[PDB]
Each structure stands twice: as C-alpha cells, then as structure tokens.
C-alpha cells in the first residue's frame, strides 16, 4: 500500500536545556541567554579611554604625589582604574576629609583642566614656598605634592596672608588645600613664628576655621606631624577666600571640571587595550546582546544583569529523538 | 508530551528531514522521500523568534555603576549598600532561572501541539480514504502518485476523486 507519515526533525545536536518537569533535555536548537566570557582587558567606554592611576590612589593623583608625575597629562576619561591596594597616596600622613565623597565626584569628568590657581612665584612675596619633606621623596630627593605649597616664614616672620580666587571659568573648580599640625610647640614656633595660629577658608556656601592641634603621635611614614587635607567645589561666579597666619598648606594648582554622572572606579589588574564596549568589568570587557552575565557583579555602564546562574539556555527546537 | 504526539504516538524524529521542523514522509511506487511542511514550520519560527525577542528585549539597561566605597565609621551604610546589591542579584537570578525553566516546558509543549495539529489536519482531509497505522502514518486505500502526495501536503487534496476507488478496496478488505 501507499503511505504518508507525519513526523518531526532530528539532528546531531548535543545541546541540553532544563525544563520544569525534566532536567538535561537534549534539543535540536537552542539559544544562550548568559554571557560567561570576557576578553581580559580594559576598553574604552562611551567611546573614550579610562584613567589608569597605576601605582597611585585617587588621593595621590589629585593632590599631586611626586611619584605620580606621569598621570597629570590626561584630561578625559569615562571610568577610573585603581590598583586594589594603592602604594602611593598621601605621602605625608594625615586625614583626607570626605575622601569617599570626592572619589564619587571624580568618578567621571567629561572635561577636566588643571590650572595654577595661585602661581608659586607671584602669589607669596612674604612667605617661603620651598618646603619639602623626606616622606614625599622623588628620585631620592625630598619633595612635596605638585598641587600644594608648604608655606613657611621668611625673614623671621610669617605675616598675615589673605588670598582670594574668583571662579570665572564657567565650570566647577575643585580646590584642594591642607593644614599642618606639628608634633611639638618648638616646631610650631620654628615654622610659623607663632604658638596660636588659624586657617580660614570661606566661600559663599563654605565656611570653616582650622586650628592646629599640637600633640605627640605615632610615627606614620617617619613623621609625627600631620597634614589634614580638605577640598571644596567652587561654583562659577563664586569666590573662595584663604586667610591664615600659619600652618596653611596653600593651593598651587586647581581643577576646572565638567561632570559625567553615573560612572565609577574599578579595582583591576587587567591590562589596557584599544577595544570598545558598552560594558567593562574588572576581569575584562563584555559585548553581545545577551541579557544576562555571570562574569562579575561590579559592572560599569549598561550591562547585562548579573546573575549567579551557571547556565541560562532556552530551547527553540524540539526534543531531539534521532 | 502534553499533547501526546512527540515522544507519544509519533515515537521518533527523522534525521533525514533536514528542511524543516515538521514534515512528511511518503512511500509510493514512484519513490520515497522526506518533505518539510514550510507553512507550519514558518509559523513556529515566527512565534518562537518573537518569544526570544520578548525575553531578551524587555530587559532595558541604564548606564550605571554598582561599586561604592565607605570608611570605617560607615559600616551600616556599607552593609545597606551590600543588602541592595545582593537583593537585586537574588531576585534577577531567581526570575531568570524560573523564566527559562517554565518557558522551556511551554516551548516543547508548543511543538507537540503543532505536530498534533498537523496530524489532525491530514486525518481530516483523508477521512475514510486511508487507515491510521497508529505511528503517525496513514495507509491509502487507493493509489496516490507524487501529484496526489503534493495535494495532501499543500492541503489541496481532493477527497471525491479517490473516494470510489477507496470504497472498493475498503470493501474488498
């Protein structure tokens, strides 16, 4: 007799998916929903390269640590790469105020230019601007931060100083400075020629008075002294006024910046490359339209949702019965 | 199978049918061959393509950054930040695994339904002109050339033309 039969497809596929009723079902065709591979390198996000701090921390980079002279160049980045435990930060020991907040503010900046807010030669006629320290050594020589000046007395005097800066740059200007706390009154008289000093930093919305705290304290980086670091964001059209009769670590270079909200800092040991991506992880970068990944929870930008799943494969074909 | 065809009364699949998901196998004096049903295969491809597009493209991702830093007097806020991150990862993991499990069962049910529907379509066309073997096959009570087979597959099969010849063979048996 003559026969016609109804049947269905089969192939050599070894794909397996999981279903509600049965696990590990072999199927003819399937698609993967889970990205589980990276390229092991750092790529451009949003089209622009990231800032590699290398050996430095954000604290060392933004203050101008003598061992970070190579990082001053760049003025554009999308995210920041920092070593897990950075070796070069605040070479002179002290408390960096609101440091995490500052790292969040600097997480991404579209335009970022450095300019000498108080020129070293013109701004301090009656103060010594050459102060250095062995804790901030560069090439076996005592140095200091590039963006700060250690003001000490000249001709046996530390006169009252008053210095203002008006932000005419039509962008937020980041100003950093410091206050020095000597270990003993003797060092205080030698450096600033006074026992009671004060530092005042005020703007239209900022106001804080600093008083040196002289005490003996454990040696950090071979220094019993301390320099507390401070910062403020000066809005365009606003003035910041520095008044001090001692202990001020004055600003030399400031930063006019324009933000790029939503980015951040990653801790990675992965090398750099010229690739581009919408997603980058500390392990490496990722592509694909896949809506899920299990590479790393810490992502940057628009990334597939991280899931702990080891496998997310949905069937499109039939049960494979060859 | 939920509809009883795949791994049911049609016990196996055909590696010989490369052209489609569902199709036919015919045996007559002229020849033997595997043929694919392009209409029902295309419908299944369209539906499952839209199913994949739905799962993938409902997931819209804004440009964001998970990582945050905290000092030693901010432990409660660090743990609150950790509770947020772990909590969303918990939910999306559970949603993704459950979604894939359930919709994989529905997708295999879907093929079972399509095969069953194609078998009933042919059975509704042949009527008494053929008898059901039980394995997804029909045995014609009349002769059926390659043009007659192509009418069964195209759904343009004509019942009256072969009805009288089928009745005589059915009466003989």
């Amino acid at each position, epitope marked *: 007799g003559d026969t016609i039969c109804i049947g269905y497809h089969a*192939n050599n596929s070894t794909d397996t998916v999981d279903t509600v009723l049965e696990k590990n079902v072999t199927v*003819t*065709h399937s*698609v993967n929903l889970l990205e589980d591979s990276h390229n092991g390198k750092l790529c451009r996000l949003k089209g622009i390269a990231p800032l590699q701090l290398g050996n430095c921390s954000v604290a060392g980079w933004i203050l101008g640590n003598p061992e970070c002279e190579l990082l001053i160049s760049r003025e554009s980045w999308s995210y920041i790469v920092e070593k897990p435990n950075p070796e070069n930060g605040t070479c002179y020991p002290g408390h960096f105020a609101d440091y995490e907040e500052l790292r969040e503010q600097l997480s991404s900046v579209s335009s970022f230019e450095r300019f000498e807010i108080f020129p070293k030669e013109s701004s301090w006629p009656n103060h010594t601007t050459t102060g250095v320290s062995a804790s901030c050594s560069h090439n076996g020589e005592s140095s200091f931060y590039k963006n700060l000046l250690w003001l000490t007395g000249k001709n046996g005097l530390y006169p009252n100083l008053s210095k203002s800066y008006a932000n005419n740059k039509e962008k937020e200007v980041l100003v950093l400075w410091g206050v020095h706390h000597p270990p003993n009154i003797g060092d205080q008289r030698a450096l600033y020629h006074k026992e009671n000093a004060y530092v005042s930093v005020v703007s239209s919305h900022y106001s804080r008075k600093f008083t040196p705290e002289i005490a003996k304290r454990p040696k950090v980086r071979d220094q019993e002294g301390r320099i507390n670091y401070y910062w403020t964001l000066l809005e365009p059209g606003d003035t910041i006024i520095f008044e001090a009769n001692g202990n001020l670590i004055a600003p030399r270079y400031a930063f006019a910046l324009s933000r790029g909200f939503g980015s951040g800092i990653i801790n990675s040991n992965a090398p750099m490359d010229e690739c581009d991506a919408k997603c980058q992880t500390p392990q490496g970068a990722i592509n694909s339209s896949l809506p899920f990944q299990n590479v790393h929870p810490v992502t940057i930008g628009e990334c597939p949702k991280y899931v702990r799943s080891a496998k997310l494969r949905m069937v*499109t*074909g039939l049960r494979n019965i060859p | 199978g939920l509809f009883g065809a795949i791994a049911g009364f049609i016990e196996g699949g055909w590696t010989g049918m*490369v*052209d*489609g*998901w569902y199709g036919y196998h015919h045996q007559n004096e002229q020849g033997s061959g595997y*043929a*694919a049903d*392009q*209409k029902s*295969t*295309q419908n299944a*491809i*369209n539906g*499952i*393509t839209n199913k*994949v*597009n739905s799962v993938i493209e409902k997931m819209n991702t804004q440009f964001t950054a998970v990582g945050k830093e905290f000092n030693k007097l901010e432990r409660r806020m660090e743990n609150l930040n950790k509770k947020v991150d772990d909590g969303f990862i918990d939910i999306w993991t559970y949603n993704a695994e459950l979604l894939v499990l359930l919709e994989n069962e529905r997708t295999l049910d879907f093929h079972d339904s399509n095969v069953k529907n194609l078998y009933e379509k042919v059975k509704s066309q042949l009527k008494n002109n053929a008898k059901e073997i039980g394995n997804g096959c029909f045995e014609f009570y009349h002769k059926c050339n390659d043009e007659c087979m*192509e009418s069964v597959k*195209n759904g343009t099969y004509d019942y009256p033309k072969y009805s009288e010849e089928s009745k005589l063979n059915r009466e003989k048996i």
Partner: nanobody, 124 residues
Framework: EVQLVESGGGLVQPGGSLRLSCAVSISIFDIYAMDWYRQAPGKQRDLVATSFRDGSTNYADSVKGRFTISRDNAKNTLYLQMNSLKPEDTAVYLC??????????????????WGKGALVTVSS
C-alpha cells in the same frame, strides 16, 4: 535535500538581454527568500537581487532598473531578466534560496541552499 540548477549562462555582446533560470526540486510557493548572487574572479560574492514570499523585490544599486527577478510558481523556477548588459556585469551567477524567515538563528539556519552557478560574459 533541495537541488538548485541554473541555466542560460553564455556569452553576450554589450547592450544585449539575457534571462537566467533556476530550477528547484521542491515547491517554491512558500519559500521566504530567493536570491541571485554574482561573483567575478578576484571579487567577493555580491547580492544582486532578492525575491520575497510577499512579492517584494530588492535590487543592488548597480543592477537596478536593468535586472528583474521573478519566480514562476508553476514551474518551480526563479528567473533573472538581465537587460542593457555592460562588460562590468561579467560574473558567475549563483542561485540562493532561504526557505524561512529566521533573523535570530532560531531554527539554526536550516533551509538555505546554493546553486551550482552559471557564467555570464559580456564582451566586445
């Protein structure tokens, strides 16, 4: 398995006309897309024309207005009517078929087949 056999390939003088035909062993009525590719020595494969199930047509800029693709459902044949031929149109023409519309590779790209080819030479 589906067989595609081209025919009509030969040499032709410029300004002439030629029709190529492609014979499919399986009914072409429900086939999603049927294509003509051309390949010249030292060149890549180029999409020349495409016919779709709905009756739509897509042509490359180079052959547009001079070439016409059409399918004869009854003869299971795909035609490429080439008019106003130029010497640059010299190529080996390839018949391609795609049974289904599968943008996401859902069905693994099944139902795609290639013809053997037919040489068209425009000279003198």
């Amino acid at each position: 398995e589906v067989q595609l056999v081209e025919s009509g390939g030969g040499l032709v003088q410029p300004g002439g006309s030629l029709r190529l035909s492609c014979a499919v062993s399986i009914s072409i009525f429900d086939i999603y897309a049927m294509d003509w590719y051309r390949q010249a020595p030292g060149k890549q494969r180029d999409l020349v024309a495409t016919s779709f199930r709905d009756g739509s047509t897509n042509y490359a800029d180079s052959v547009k207005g001079r070439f016409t693709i059409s399918r004869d459902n009854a003869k299971n044949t795909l035609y490429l009517q080439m008019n106003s031929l130029k010497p640059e149109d010299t190529a080996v023409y390839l018949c391609h078929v795609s049974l289904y519309r599968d943008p996401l590779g859902v069905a693994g790209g099944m139902g795609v087949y290639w013809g053997k080819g037919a040489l068209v030479t425009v000279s003198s």
